[PDB]
Structures are given as structure tokens and as C-alpha cells.
Design a protein around this nucleic acid. Structure first.
Ligand SMILES: [Mn+2]
Ligand SMILES: [Mn+2]
Ligand SMILES: [Mn+2]
Ligand SMILES: [Mn+2]
Length: 119
DNA sequence: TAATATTACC
């Protein structure tokens, strides 16, 4: 059993090179039932570590995630890997956003959509 | 928490 019920989600996809814009657009539709209001997606590359993606999602309605694989994403080129995330309820949207945007290596590895919600 | 995995607010 896996359950998280929150308007605010913090996702981390380890060992994942997905372009942030395409991950964002895909999570917008997977979460469309909860009316996403803001999403930030960041692809983190750094010389001595594994590449990964973080996503912050702020929804209008409380998301009900009861399947741990509900936000899995598949890349559209060989080897067609499936990326499974760590899913969490965000304790502090401002701290999550600061953490993931301060880690990034360049502004080209960040994607944003919507208006940031002052929680 | 599962289920990716060393990556995941603090
Ligand atoms: Mn990171
Ligand atoms: Mn586990
Ligand atoms: Mn493992
Ligand atoms: Mn952890």
C-alpha cells in the first residue's frame, strides 16, 4: 500500500535524463484531474553524480495517489527506459523550489509552467 | 509508504 494525499507534490526521478519540458507536459496531463496550477521541473547534471529530475507540482485540488507507479514515465527513444519517481507530499513548497532550482547547472535544464502559489 | 535509486524539502 502506498498513499499520499496532498495538493503539493515533490517528485524525484533518479538516474533519469528526461528533458524537463517534456516531463512537465506529461505530468500536467497525468495529474489533470487535480487541476495543476504550477509545475517546476529541473534536470540536475553535475560532474561527479548521477543525473536526475526533480518536479514540484502545486495543484488546486488535493491529489490522491494510491498507486506508487501512477507517475511513471517512459522515454520515447531507445532504450525506452521507464523512470519511476520517489513521490512525496511537499512539506514546504518554497523550500523545495529553492532546493531544486539552486542545484541546477544552467537555466536550460529548468522548465516552469503556471503562476507560483503562495502557500 | 513503493520502488526508482544515492536520488528525494528539513
Ligand atoms: Mn537533486
Ligand atoms: Mn523502499
Ligand atoms: Mn534498488
Ligand atoms: Mn528517502
Amino acid at each position: 500500500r502506498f498513499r499520499v494525499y496532498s495538493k503539493y507534490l515533490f517528485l524525484t526521478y533518479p538516474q533519469c535524463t528526461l528533458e524537463p519540458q517534456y516531463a512537465l507536459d506529461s505530468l500536467r496531463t497525468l495529474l489533470n484531474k487535480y487541476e495543476p496550477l504550477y509545475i517546476a521541473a529541473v534536470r540536475e547534471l553535475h560532474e561527479d553524480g548521477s543525473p536526475h529530475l526533480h518536479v514540484l507540482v502545486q495543484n488546486k485540488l488535493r491529489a490522491s495517489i494510491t498507486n506508487p507507479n501512477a507517475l511513471n514515465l517512459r522515454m520515447d527513444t531507445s532504450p525506452f527506459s521507464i523512470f519511476h519517481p520517489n513521490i512525496q507530499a511537499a512539506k514546504d513548497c518554497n523550500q523545495v523550489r529553492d532546493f531544486i532550482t539552486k542545484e541546477v547547472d544552467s537555466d536550460v535544464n529548468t522548465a516552469e509552467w503556471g503562476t507560483f502559489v503562495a502557500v
